[PDB]
């Protein structure tokens, strides 16, 4: 009733936006997702995602995708290593924990979510450039593409979104660490020493404020990231400048790690950032709008916070808009944001404290 004959548009086909779309759509809501990626075959770069029982998994369950997530996700142990290649501890998964936090590939997750949507719910190759209100509908502008309208806009296009002003003036800011990530295909061939060191588990190592994280089996490829406190001699279009840089930082490290760096083809660098939720969001907005996911609360990832907060957002917001407990769309948005500010501020504070802890000089997992 609340959303009757209301055209809802979600900006961004990430995991949060798509989950939001499904939870709305299954309540008979007209929902469109606009995604800048040119087609659904676009590969998603990055490591795997793990859904927690009380948040991400609950969102999948309410969407009817929990068993699908289990069917595709993969339980994985963790090895803690030192710079000399020693395994300090192996934290393996007991049966009682095997489905607690199984890791799933980002493209796989996109696909199950896309498959849960009606055909053409998601419009590909639609990069939102500007969002402007009308007396009754939003006007959405796409780069070199026809414009669209909506009665309610949900910003879900990530932590670097540029279309937040009508909700908040808050700016993203850098937290002081930097990440270099890459994929190695056929790691059993290209980086065998380090591959066997992972030994089918995720691997983490810390030495001199330099942290390394790896997943040996991300749909047949090894994904890894190296992270450090920030402060440019490095061009990421020039793999040579990156290798020279990483090999200096990892001079103390075992050759198996040096092999990993030398064989990597393409490096991706990214400054860690946070969209701080300190100051409250705008009280009066021209038309119904809100934000979910990283657009709402981007935060450091080193403690495992991230997508699950965003899936919690989709769950509460979609509930509020469709559980009939609110007199207006605005009141339903108001309640969601109040809840999200509460448990989201907690997540951010945990993520900031962990970032300081892990890149401190004494850190030893
Ligand atoms: C190095 C690193 C490691 C991480 N590790 C983890 C981890 O282990 N676990 C975890 O839970 N989280 C992790 N995170 C965080 C996690 O990836 C995010 O919290 C999660 O992806 C949030 O999803 P989202 O849908 O809100 O945003 P995104 O995943 O960024 O999705 C945004 C979507 O919007 C699209 N988009 C962007 N601009 C536009 C536009 N103008 N118009 C239309 N569409 C647009 C994008 O193409 C994308 O499809 C990590 C992050 C980093 C940087």
Author numbering: 23 to 253, 260 to 393
Quote the authors verbatim.
Furthermore, we describe in detail Tet(X7), a tetracycline-resistance enzyme recovered from a human gut metagenome that confers resistance to tigecycline, omadacycline, and eravacycline. Based on sequence homology to these soil-derived enzymes, we identified an additional enzyme, Tet(56), as a previously uncharacterized tetracycline resistance determinant in Legionella longbeachae. These enzymes are structurally and functionally homologous to Tet(X)12, the flavin-dependent monooxygenase (FMO) originally discovered in Bacteroides fragilis. The emergence of Tet(X)29, Tet(X3)14, Tet(X4), and now Tet(X7) in clinical pathogens now establishes covalent inactivation of tetracycline antibiotics as a bona fide clinical resistance mechanism. We show that the monohydroxylated product of Tet(X) and Tet(X7) reaction with tigecycline coelute, indicating that the site of hydroxylation by Tet(X7) is also C11a.
More structural information dictating enzyme function and substrate recognition, such as the 2.55 Å resolution structure of Tet(X7) reported here, is needed to guide the rational design of next-generation tetracyclines capable of evading enzymatic inactivation. Structurally, the enzyme resembles Tet(X) more so than the tetracycline-inactivating enzymes Tet(50,51,55,56) owing to the presence of a single C-terminal bridging helix, rather than the two observed in the soil-derived enzymes. The FAD in Tet(X7) retains an IN-conformation analogous to the substrate-free Tet(X) structure. Instead, it is plausible that these differences allow for altered conformational dynamics and may allosterically affect enzyme activity. The changes exhibited a pattern where, in Tet(X7), the substituted amino acids were either smaller (Lys351Glu, Ile359Ala, Glu366Ala, and Lys377Ser) or were less hydrophilic (Glu366Ala, Thr369Ile, Gln370Ile). We suspect that these differences may affect the dynamics of the hydrophobic cavity resulting in faster enzyme turnover. A further difference that may play a role in substrate tolerance is a ten-amino acid C-terminal truncation of Tet(X7) compared with Tet(X) and Tet(X3) (seven amino acid difference from Tet(X4); Supplementary Fig. 4).
